Amino acid sequence: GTILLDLAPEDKEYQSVEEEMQSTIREHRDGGNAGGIFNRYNVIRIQKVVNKKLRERFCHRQKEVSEENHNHHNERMLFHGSPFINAIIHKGFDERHAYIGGMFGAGIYFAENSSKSNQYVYGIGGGTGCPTHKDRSCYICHRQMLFCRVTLGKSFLQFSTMKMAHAPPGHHSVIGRPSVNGLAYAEYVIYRGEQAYPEYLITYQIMKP
Ligand SMILES: CC(C)(O)c1ccc(-c2nc3c(F)cc(F)cc3c(=O)[nH]2)cc1
Ligand SMILES: [Zn+2]
């Protein structure tokens, strides 16, 4: 099964992940309702997720998408928050557990801004917040999020909602791009679980400003 390798804070790999997580924090349009109010995270640990079987499924699909898209698989490192993160590290990403109510329909959603994925750690809209205190802005409880390899292939770009069950014909993913009267931050959607790998597991707290 899945093995977690602990990365030391002194390692460049830990430092790159933490820097991407911290630098991509943004102020959200919901006044912090979903994910809480913070300018910084306190990173507890960063672990590399090892699973040969899951890795093979991901690499097999990446090669297939690369062949279909003029040798450009268009992988990107992106964040994912979910209340069911434990299932993802042990069983991998699964479109059978898609976010049905997402703006692009029943896909698996990722963010390039860590704070957007932080809005989903305790569920859609932040749910009822942490299990212990029922606080979406809890500064005590440890949160987890994933920093993932995502195979995008040929993306269908959109500015506003377009619900679908599967990728558009001839495409491998959908991207919601930010725009003036539209999205604040980008989102990336795949419709096949084998198009993402949970590369890193980050344990963190949000910090009170
Ligand atoms: C079905 C359920 C509850 O398991 C679930 C629901 C939504 C997410 C989720 N949505 C996201 C989103 F819409 C846009 C975005 F940019 C990132 C994200 C993200 O990181 N996570 C994850 C799990
Ligand atoms: Zn709490």
UniProtKB/Swiss-Prot annotation:
Zn(2+) binds at residues 130, 133, 138, 141. Phosphorylated on serine residues by MAPK kinases upon insulin stimulation. Phosphorylated during mitosis. Ubiquitous; highest levels in testis. It comes from the Eukaryota. It is found in: Cytoplasm; Golgi apparatus membrane; Cytoplasm, Cytoskeleton, Microtubule organizing center, Centrosome; Nucleus, Nuclear pore complex. Residues 8-209 form the PARP catalytic domain. Belongs to the ARTD/PARP family. Poly-ADP-ribosyltransferase involved in various processes such as Wnt signaling pathway, telomere length and vesicle trafficking. Acts as an activator of the Wnt signaling pathway by mediating poly-ADP-ribosylation (PARsylation) of AXIN1 and AXIN2, 2 key components of the beta-catenin destruction complex: poly-ADP-ribosylated target proteins are recognized by RNF146, which mediates their ubiquitination and subsequent degradation. Also mediates PARsylation of BLZF1 and CASC3, followed by recruitment of RNF146 and subsequent ubiquitination. This is Poly [ADP-ribose] polymerase tankyrase-1. It comes from Homo sapiens. The lineage of its organism: Eukaryota, Metazoa, Chordata, Craniata, Vertebrata.
